[PDB]
Design an enzyme around this catalytic site. Structure first.
Site, mmCIF file in Angstrom:
data_model
loop_
_atom_site.group_PDB
_atom_site.id
_atom_site.type_symbol
_atom_site.label_atom_id
_atom_site.label_comp_id
_atom_site.label_asym_id
_atom_site.label_seq_id
_atom_site.Cartn_x
_atom_site.Cartn_y
_atom_site.Cartn_z
ATOM 1 N N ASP B 25 -78.554 -40.094 64.518
ATOM 2 C CA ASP B 25 -78.249 -39.920 63.095
ATOM 3 C C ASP B 25 -79.507 -40.187 62.275
ATOM 4 O OD1 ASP B 25 -77.231 -39.820 60.557
ATOM 5 O OD2 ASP B 25 -75.589 -41.234 60.934
ATOM 6 N N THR B 26 -80.246 -39.121 61.954
ATOM 7 C CA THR B 26 -81.471 -39.268 61.179
ATOM 8 C C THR B 26 -81.209 -39.654 59.727
ATOM 9 O OG1 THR B 26 -81.509 -36.886 60.709
ATOM 10 C CG2 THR B 26 -82.696 -37.660 62.661
ATOM 11 N N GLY B 27 -79.978 -39.517 59.247
ATOM 12 C CA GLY B 27 -79.618 -39.962 57.918
ATOM 13 C C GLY B 27 -79.233 -41.419 57.812
HETATM 14 C C1 LIG Z 1 -76.760 -49.714 49.931
HETATM 15 C C2 LIG Z 1 -76.311 -48.481 50.749
HETATM 16 O O1 LIG Z 1 -76.877 -47.325 50.206
HETATM 17 P P1 LIG Z 1 -75.910 -46.234 49.417
HETATM 18 O O2 LIG Z 1 -76.709 -45.580 48.382
HETATM 19 C C3 LIG Z 1 -75.330 -44.928 50.635
HETATM 20 O O3 LIG Z 1 -76.327 -43.927 50.746
HETATM 21 C C4 LIG Z 1 -76.153 -43.061 51.857
HETATM 22 C C5 LIG Z 1 -74.752 -42.527 52.204
HETATM 23 C C6 LIG Z 1 -74.565 -41.587 53.412
HETATM 24 C C7 LIG Z 1 -75.769 -41.187 54.257
HETATM 25 C C8 LIG Z 1 -75.561 -40.247 55.481
HETATM 26 C C9 LIG Z 1 -74.877 -41.061 56.564
HETATM 27 N N1 LIG Z 1 -75.681 -42.252 56.730
HETATM 28 C C10 LIG Z 1 -75.106 -43.600 56.854
HETATM 29 O O4 LIG Z 1 -73.955 -43.813 56.694
HETATM 30 O O5 LIG Z 1 -76.032 -44.623 57.183
HETATM 31 C C11 LIG Z 1 -75.592 -46.061 57.138
HETATM 32 C C12 LIG Z 1 -75.908 -46.565 58.196
HETATM 33 O O6 LIG Z 1 -77.395 -46.896 58.007
HETATM 34 C C13 LIG Z 1 -77.566 -47.097 56.518
HETATM 35 O O7 LIG Z 1 -78.693 -46.040 55.894
HETATM 36 C C14 LIG Z 1 -78.086 -45.214 55.119
HETATM 37 C C15 LIG Z 1 -76.768 -45.879 54.779
HETATM 38 C C16 LIG Z 1 -76.466 -46.840 56.002
HETATM 39 C C17 LIG Z 1 -74.853 -40.295 57.906
HETATM 40 O O8 LIG Z 1 -76.120 -39.848 58.209
HETATM 41 C C18 LIG Z 1 -73.897 -39.090 57.807
HETATM 42 N N2 LIG Z 1 -72.489 -39.581 57.705
HETATM 43 C C19 LIG Z 1 -71.620 -39.386 58.898
HETATM 44 C C20 LIG Z 1 -71.886 -40.489 59.946
HETATM 45 C C21 LIG Z 1 -71.463 -41.839 59.375
HETATM 46 C C22 LIG Z 1 -71.061 -40.187 61.200
HETATM 47 S S1 LIG Z 1 -71.727 -39.295 56.165
HETATM 48 O O9 LIG Z 1 -72.668 -39.383 55.045
HETATM 49 O O10 LIG Z 1 -70.732 -40.316 55.829
HETATM 50 C C23 LIG Z 1 -70.993 -37.591 56.313
HETATM 51 C C24 LIG Z 1 -71.817 -36.368 55.888
HETATM 52 C C25 LIG Z 1 -71.206 -34.956 56.029
HETATM 53 C C26 LIG Z 1 -69.789 -34.789 56.597
HETATM 54 O O11 LIG Z 1 -69.233 -33.487 56.720
HETATM 55 C C27 LIG Z 1 -67.840 -33.409 56.900
HETATM 56 C C28 LIG Z 1 -68.980 -36.024 57.028
HETATM 57 C C29 LIG Z 1 -69.587 -37.434 56.888
HETATM 58 C C30 LIG Z 1 -77.166 -41.726 53.916
HETATM 59 C C31 LIG Z 1 -77.353 -42.665 52.705
HETATM 60 O O12 LIG Z 1 -74.625 -47.003 48.686
HETATM 61 C C32 LIG Z 1 -73.310 -46.890 49.201
HETATM 62 C C33 LIG Z 1 -72.293 -47.115 48.071
#
Ligand SMILES: CCOP(=O)(COc1ccc(C[C@H](NC(=O)O[C@H]2CO[C@H]3OCC[C@H]32)[C@H](O)CN(CC(C)C)S(=O)(=O)c2ccc(OC)cc2)cc1)OCC
Lengths: 99, 99
Positions: B25-27
């Site tokens: 997960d590069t995101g």
């Molecule tokens: C303080 C926290 O910062 P924030 O601004 C959240 O800012 C994000 C949100 C989502 C992503 C992508 C997902 N990364 C992420 O959650 O990362 C977590 C874990 O490491 C931390 O770094 C970034 C946020 C932590 C991941 O790469 C993709 N996800 C699916 C995965 C969990 C299986 S998703 O975004 O939920 C998704 C996209 C498209 C879809 O199509 C149906 C379904 C689901 C990046 C940054 O505040 C929250 C209120």
């Protein structure tokens, strides 16, 4: 090009005649973009991840240019914190993971 | 190897002597695994995703082998919808994006 992962893989994209920064996200099935008033019809949708689900608007056959590479597919618009380029578009620009 | 994105980039990992399936997960900044028992001390932490924040347990300097490549780093354990390998470990195994 090759993008290392020391920092977030942020790139410039072009959509609906606008430039934005978006995250190349191999963990995202779909592409989710920050709120924007795209024209045309759409369908309500819910996508979930860490923290739960959010409501988004699904637009189809939207053209996006990612680092000069063109891609056409579904784009979800809603209250996402970051612009997320998902696999549905990454595949079209020939993106792979390599190690 | 080289991994295309037509399917989810799921790989087998080995942590705490147990095999699991996880998403490259590069995101994701950090690595977040579903609920499991790990030895050693842990500190409570919080991480935010698309749908809000969740409470996780932070394990530091944990050995984890990803598709045959060893890493030692931080692993968060909590109610994530799926096991995700984030950039903190993707960098250790030499993973890059290429297109
Ligand atoms: C303080 C926290 O910062 P924030 O601004 C959240 O800012 C994000 C949100 C989502 C992503 C992508 C997902 N990364 C992420 O959650 O990362 C977590 C874990 O490491 C931390 O770094 C970034 C946020 C932590 C991941 O790469 C993709 N996800 C699916 C995965 C969990 C299986 S998703 O975004 O939920 C998704 C996209 C498209 C879809 O199509 C149906 C379904 C689901 C990046 C940054 O505040 C929250 C209120």
């Amino acid at each position: 090009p090759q993008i290392t992962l020391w920092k977030r893989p942020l790139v410039t994209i072009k959509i609906g005649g606008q430039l934005k920064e978006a995250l190349l996200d191999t963990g995202a099935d779909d592409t989710v973009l920050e709120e924007m008033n795209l024209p045309g019809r759409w369908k309500p949708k819910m996508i979930g991840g860490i923290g739960g689900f959010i409501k988004v608007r699904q637009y189809d056959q939207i053209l996006i240019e990612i680092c000069g590479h063109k891609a056409i597919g579904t784009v979800l618009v809603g209250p996402t914190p970051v612009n997320i380029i998902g696999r549905n578009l990454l595949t079209q620009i020939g993106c792979t993971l390599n190690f």
